[PDB]
Paper text:
SEC is composed of the positive elongation factor b (P-TEFb) including cyclin-dependent kinase 9 and Cyclin T (CycT1/2), the transcription factor ELL1/210,11, the scaffold protein AFF1/47,8,10, and ENL/AF9. Although the three binding sites of AFF4 that bind to its partners in SEC have been well defined, the structure of its C-terminal homology domain (hereafter referred to as THD) of AFF4 has not been solved.
The crystal structure of human AFF4-THD was determined by Se-SAD, and the structure was refined with native data to 2.4 Å resolution. Only one molecule of AFF-THD presents in the asymmetric unit though the AFF-THD was eluted at a volume consistent with dimer from a gel filtration column. Most residues were localized clearly, except for the highly flexible loop from G1045 to S1082 as well as the very N- and C-terminal residues. The structure of AFF-THD is comprised of eight alpha helices, of which α2, α3, α6 (Ala1116–Ala1120), α7, and α8 constitute a ring with α4 located in the center. Although the sequence of AFF4-TPRL is not predicted as TPRs, AFF4-TPRL arranges in a fold that resembles three TPRs with α8 posing in the concave groove. In contrast, AFF4-TPRL contributes its last helix to fill the hydrophobic cleft formed by AFF4-TPRL, a novel protein fold. Though only one AFF-THD was visualized in the asymmetric unit, analytical gel filtration indicated that AFF-THD is a dimer in solution. As shown in the model, the dimerization of AFF-THD is mediated mainly by α5, and α6 (Ser1082 to T1107), as well as part of α4.
Author numbering:
A (entry chain A), B (entry chain A): 903 to 960, 965 to 994, 995A, 996 to 1045, 1082 to 1158
């Protein structure tokens, strides 16, 4: 067993993008699904590195979103639920799901401000509009279109961590099935922490796991 | 320094409630704010223990919600932002904010199912209702009241982890100001993990911190 030693020379968001694109076009031009997915996942981490480098001198939202799309494509390659699925396929899938979960959670986190005060005004008006459509009794609803767009966007950015939570839990569950591989990987890297691991932690974790997979 | 040894005999949700209520009525009848808050926080953990015991033979939602209310009351006692605020006040506040954060996150988590498919239907209709209020051009909005109630509830349960995230981050920030006390507490208990620590982990963590505070 060997641990990657990691270069601290942080580059420009541009450098990681041609890295990612090259790994990805390397993936695009190969036969064996497994092979493809590995390179796709390597491409993915370079894409993540690029987004991280955007966040250093401030927007990474599009880059991250499209990266989660490339992760779903990749997972649909050697589907871990297939009955022939190998341990390698399942470990690959786990790494994919960690990247996808924490990516979703970052996509959210970029719009946390929006989400919070949107929640305030929305809670207020989703009571005003309702109290005003019901004639009192002594003894469809119509909303301002601003309120409507604010509802649309609130659901938009809250969806991202609904996905993050659910996918995080799939990663944990499927990880129990490769308890040893991921026990050792958590040993040498430290385990990923939902809400605490930054993008560089994820990048290195994923790189190390990809390294062991390519070594078999 | 001494670590509490913890009793594994899990009791009924009823047993913890009269424990909590007794600690709380002990708090209610004392002068010194600090004193009060300590007992309030002890009351709180018994209240949490009670809610946990509800979850064992399946609803803890009300109990948890009202407990977070007792936590905000308690924090409004020796406000850590006061200029006379002691290290003890600040540590107490940190413990309060962990309980409040993870309580919010559980309140959410109880309704995760609701939230997810609500997100689906809401995203669809928040496009149907909008595409149908805008006359096309070749070259306020009205919604079903079911959709309206679903929007209200979706915002309701997503608010809970918006709070959980924000309060979690306040706890981290204020924790940097008592880095050593909480470094040692994480040492002997293991640190609380957002999204991973279960209620019993929180109970024991908080109990241990309360123990050191009462020892000064």
């Amino acid at each position: 067993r060997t641990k990657l030693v990691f270069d601290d020379r942080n580059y420009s968001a541009d450098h990681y993008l041609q890295e990612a694109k090259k790994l990805k076009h390397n993936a695009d031009a190969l036969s064996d699904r497994f092979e493809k997915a590995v390179y796709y996942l390597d491409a993915v981490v370079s894409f993540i590195e690029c987004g991280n480098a955007l966040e250093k001198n401030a927007s990474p939202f599009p880059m991250y979103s499209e990266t989660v799309d490339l992760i779903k494509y990749t997972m649909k390659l050697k589907n871990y639920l297939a009955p022939d699925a190998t341990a390698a396929d399942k470990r690959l899938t786990v790494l994919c799901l960690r990247c996808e979960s924490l990516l979703y959670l970052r996509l959210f986190k970029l719009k946390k401000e929006n989400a919070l005060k949107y929640s305030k005004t929305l809670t207020e008006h989703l009571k005003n509009s309702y109290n005003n459509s019901q004639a009192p009794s002594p003894g469809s609803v119509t909303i301002p279109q601003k309120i409507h767009q604010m509802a649309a966007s609130y659901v938009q950015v809250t969806s991202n961590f609904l996905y993050a939570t659910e996918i995080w839990d799939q990663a944990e569950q499927l990880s129990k099935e490769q308890k040893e591989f991921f026990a050792e990987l958590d040993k040498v890297m430290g385990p990923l922490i939902f809400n605490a691991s930054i993008m560089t932690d994820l990048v290195r974790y994923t790189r190390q796991g990809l390294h062991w997979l390519r070594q078999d």
